[PDB]
Design a protein around this nucleic acid. Structure first.
Lengths: 257, 146, 171
RNA sequence: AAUAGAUCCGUAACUUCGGGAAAAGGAUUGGCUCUGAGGACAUUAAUGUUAACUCAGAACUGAAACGGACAAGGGGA
RNA sequence: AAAAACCGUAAAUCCUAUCUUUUAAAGGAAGGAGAAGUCGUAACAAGGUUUCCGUAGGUGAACCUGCGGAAGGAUCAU
RNA sequence: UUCAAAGAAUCAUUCUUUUUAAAAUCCGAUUUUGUUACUUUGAGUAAAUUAGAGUGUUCAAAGCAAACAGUUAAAGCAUUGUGUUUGAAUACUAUAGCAUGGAAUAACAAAAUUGAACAAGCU
RNA sequence: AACCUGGUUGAUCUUGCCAGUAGUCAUAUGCUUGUCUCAAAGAUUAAGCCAUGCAAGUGAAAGUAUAUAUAUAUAUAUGUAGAAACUGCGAACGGCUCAUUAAAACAGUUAUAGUCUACUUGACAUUUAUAAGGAUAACUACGGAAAAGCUGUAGCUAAUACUUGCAUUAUCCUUUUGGAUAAGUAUUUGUUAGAAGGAAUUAUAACAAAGAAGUAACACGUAAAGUGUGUAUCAAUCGAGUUUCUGACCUAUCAGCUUUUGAUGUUAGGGUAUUGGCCUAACAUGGCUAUGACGGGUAACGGGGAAUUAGAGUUCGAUUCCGGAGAGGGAGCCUGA
């Protein structure tokens, strides 16, 4: 037959998964869920190859059996569960909270997060639908459906979704001064203020983003994520703060120690 | 005058009883022809009148034959780069396009077409705008950089 | 059953590999006669059920000038734009012309307006005699081989005039 | 003795390019009920009156039979 | 449920035709190689009839002859 | 078929900036002025392989790791315990397609037995 | 490392090829072989034929247990397990091979405003009830056949197997409150109005008809109320089918092909998950071609890639990954997302 493929070859795995060639012939195919396979990482990899808590898949299963790891404050027990771009995974045993982010290089890194920030996740809206009764519902990057959004929320906006109540608290627009983070581009993981946008009739829309050091980089509209206004980010960025350094000064300031 | 088939041509979507001719604005910067605005024809595959929608890509070409009913043949000329000899070579490809009766298409005038859903075994494009172009010789023979 | 095994655009024939897949499919037609209502069920792709009607005698038919639909029984199919063996063998297809019992429509007109929304429309004269005979002309609008029922609408105006000329400078 | 009418299809070597050729070799054919096409004539773009048998197609039908008798090439190297 | 009929999908077998590849063959006619074989002397010298071309005919063979060309000639020249 | 002119910065030069026709936009000033080829920049660029950064697998082929104090404790941080620092870069991914700056070189377009623009009156 | 050398002659300078030279993740083979590391391996020809054995099964809270075994206070109420069997899910992934295949497949680039989509994830629902019905496996006993994943008759019983079936909400008026009014999820038909897209016959809404399938007659237990299983629709996700543009080797001693028998297009329909000559009927005569159509050949699966490379190039790519195809050769079909 020709049904859905259910295996993932090790070399065919996404690059940011960052697995070794000789470490077996297969990679864990993420179960279908809230995030795309390419745009996410299974929690098996998250806490075997990143947190190093478990050194085999079986120990990953042993961890997951105890309802101790919660993705967005709800217990998850699927080994190949897609965690996705930004969300709060809380481990109760060590009482630690990680918000998943990108880095300037473009891999998925857990970021240590305090309790007050761990109940406060960001969701980039992707679609605005209206169902029966003229009730509007937002489809977010998280694969989440939020009914009864404010009318002022637009298609590309980003809402602060509270983890417990699942309700939006406030939304951020996509003006030319809005802080943004690139999610899949050549400049994945970069953070900037959106210098400008341009609308292409019937084709991809490009936006040019200004860095902290006045560095302009362009990207497609489909893979940007508003993370705040001009004032400041609404989350805590990793140690590079989303500032991608050039290949020269990166070596230069790595050398000095 | 207009009903020449052994079926009633209706222009589905026109509305006939309550309301307050049907046409749409196709988009992509193309203007709906006044002939489509105020015409009497009915064409189920017309971009501005029928059920089809223009999505995909836009091309331009030279009309090679208009002897099919509401369907014309467009030749696209282009240069293909032969790397070994570091120079180009003339090549062509002709694509069939549906032509609405709102357009008076002759032999050798450049038309622009937009991709639509498969309308026949070979038609996947529909003309959007016609610009008259005087021709000399055989349109198949002549070469236009478009 | 679809998409191959035939000449190219140029006229050349294509050597065939990739024998027939299930998703090409192509089930046999449903020559829907008129008679006692009977419908079979066909399991299409993805377990979506389709209702293959074999015989119908009634259906929902609409008064489009008034925009009101009433269920009624069809009498006889008298024209179809396609091959005219379908009318002779009395099959129901998407847009064939049939005859409809007009009594439900006349009764509805009486109970709503009286006298033998968007009210006071003055109808048309040419449909009056067709009503008075008792049987009216309608065009099917559903696909009985797909939805399992034969719905339609009364034809009037120049469309009715066109079909009237096409059926009966005439034989 | 073998078909042999007609319709549709297909037709080689060779050739003086004209033929060979009805090459060879296939299929169909009744009856019935229908459908389509092919004309002429007058009135104020539209409506009526009327003729020929000739083709094409579809159902149904029968002890699979139908150029039913009559008539009527055997081909090829 | 058996069973049957009808459209449809249609394996498979057979007939016919065409094409492709391989292959037998009396006889015919080439080419190449081998050896001190037989017959002549065609070409290279003006090669003992200058050589060669196209064409045509003839002859044991190389070849000969006619017609028109070329010098790659044996003439750069009263 | 728009040529050109004038000014700041290294060495003697080289390099940077401004305006100079016409039509619409802003009360003397606020600003766009064919198409394509071509060329420049980007976006999408699966990995393995390739080039290539780092990394003493005892070297190398490799691999993507690893490194650091610590005869067992200082230091960092937490208001008593908790190891720490990291790397897995970058480029290529047609010639075609998307967007993009463009002055040169190439084509095509418009251009008269005519074809305009403006002003006034008329519909 | 951007390289040349021997060979025509008595001798010379050329053209010109033969030979030499080096590499090959390129095969075979000969001789020889003390260590360690690394690791290709029935592709070439026979997608030839196969003995034998294995290669897809699955129950740790959570469908169904008087097969049966066990343990707690005293024949009781709890449990612990549990062969077989019914039910559920998977077996459509994976693995192998490269025969077919020459604008086909494949690759980059699009579209799906022309569609389907199990598991998983997020939202969220409409026209006897102190809990409804028969019928069956396992099993029991009587059997048949040399043999098989063969099964006959009679008797019971379960189930999350199969099948029936039980409030309420919203709206208008005086104007917290009292009165009054209305009630189908997809899908199909007819008549209308109309946050987003580039463009809607879009979302959605109104009226008139139909109308599936459902909304728990189900099982275990988390804060010092949860879960599992199942279910309508939408969305996401894992995918898929079609689809735009561009790109391929040799051959003209293949120049005209296609078109009754669909060839190109129109109209109407049928069919499909959807578009489409995909198919049917009527109609028109179109469509491709020296910029190589149509044929023929390939000891041709395509690509990522490999060898050789100064730069160009030339040759290879069955074979780690991706896509395609196939299971002796064809065809047909059931279950199922």
């Amino acid at each position: 037959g020709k049904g859905i493929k259910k295996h993932l070859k090790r070399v065919n795995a996404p690059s940011h998964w960052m697995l070794n060639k000789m470490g077996g012939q297969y990679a864990p195919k993420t179960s279908s869920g809230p995030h795309k396979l390419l745009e996410s990482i299974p929690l098996v990899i998250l806490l075997r190859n990143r947190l190093k808590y478990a050194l085999t898949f079986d120990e990953v299963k042993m961890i997951l059996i105890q309802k101790i790891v919660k993705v967005d404050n709800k217990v998850r027990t699927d080994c190949t569960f897609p965690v996705g771009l930004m969300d709060v995974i809380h481990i109760t045993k060590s009482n630690e909270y990680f918000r998943l982010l990108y880095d300037i290089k473009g891999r998925f890194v857990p970021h240590r997060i305090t309790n007050e920030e761990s109940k406060y996740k960001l969701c980039k809206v992707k679609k605005i639908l209206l169902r029966k009764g003229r009730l509007s519902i937002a489809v977010t990057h998280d694969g989440r459906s939020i009914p009864y959004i404010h009318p002022d929320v637009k298609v590309n906006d980003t809402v602060r979704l509270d983890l417990e109540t699942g309700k939006v608290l406030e939304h951020l627009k996509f003006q030319v001064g809005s802080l943004v983070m690139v999610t899949a581009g050549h400049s994945v993981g970069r953070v900037g203020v959106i210098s400008s946008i341009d609308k292409n009739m019937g084709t991809y829309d490009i936006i040019h983003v200004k860095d902290s050091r006045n560095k302009v980089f362009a990207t497609r509209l489909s893979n940007v994520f508003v993370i705040g206004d001009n004032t400041k980010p609404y989350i805590s960025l990793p140690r590079e703060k989303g500032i991608k350094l050039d290949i020269i000064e990166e070596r230069r300031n790595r050398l000095k120690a | 005058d207009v009903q020449h088939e052994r079926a009633y041509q209706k222009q589905e979507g026109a509305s006939f009883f309550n309301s307050k001719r049907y046409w749409k604005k196709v988009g992509l910067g193309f203007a709906t022809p006044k002939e489509a605005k105020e015409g009497v024809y009915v064409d189920k595959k017309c971009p501005f009148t029928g059920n089809v929608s223009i999505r995909g890509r836009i091309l331009k070409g030279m009309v090679i034959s208009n002897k099919m009913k509401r369907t014309i043949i467009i030749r696209r000329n282009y240069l293909h780069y032969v790397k070994k000899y570091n120079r180009f070579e003339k090549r062509h490809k002709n694509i069939p396009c549906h032509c609405s009766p709102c357009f008076d298409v002759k032999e050798g005038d450049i038309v622009t077409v937009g991709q639509c859903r498969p309308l026949s075994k070979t038609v996947r494009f529909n003309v959007l705008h016609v610009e008259k172009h005087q021709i000399f010789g055989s349109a198949r023979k002549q070469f236009v950089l478009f | 059953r679809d998409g191959r095994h035939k000449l190219r655009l140029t006229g050349g024939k294509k050597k065939i590999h990739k024998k027939k897949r299930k998703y090409e499919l192509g089930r046999p037609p449903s020559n829907t006669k008129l008679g006692s209502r009977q419908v079979h069920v066909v399991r299409g792709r993805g377990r979506n059920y389709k209702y293959r009607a074999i015989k119908l005698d009634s259906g929902s038919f609409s008064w489009p000038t008034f925009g009101i639909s009433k269920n009624t029984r069809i009498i006889d199919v008298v024209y179809n734009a396609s091959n005219n063996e379908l009318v002779r063998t009395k099959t129901l297809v998407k847009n064939c012309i049939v005859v409809i019992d007009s009594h439900p429509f006349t009764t509805w007109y009486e109970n709503t307006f009286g006298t033998t929304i968007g009210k006071s429309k003055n109808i048309d004269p040419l449909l009056l005699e067709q009503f008075k005979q008792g049987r009216v002309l309608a065009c099917i609008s559903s696909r009985p081989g797909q939805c399992g029922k034969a719905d339609g609408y009364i034809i009037e105006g120049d469309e009715l005039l066109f079909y009237k000329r096409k059926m009966d400078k005439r034989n």
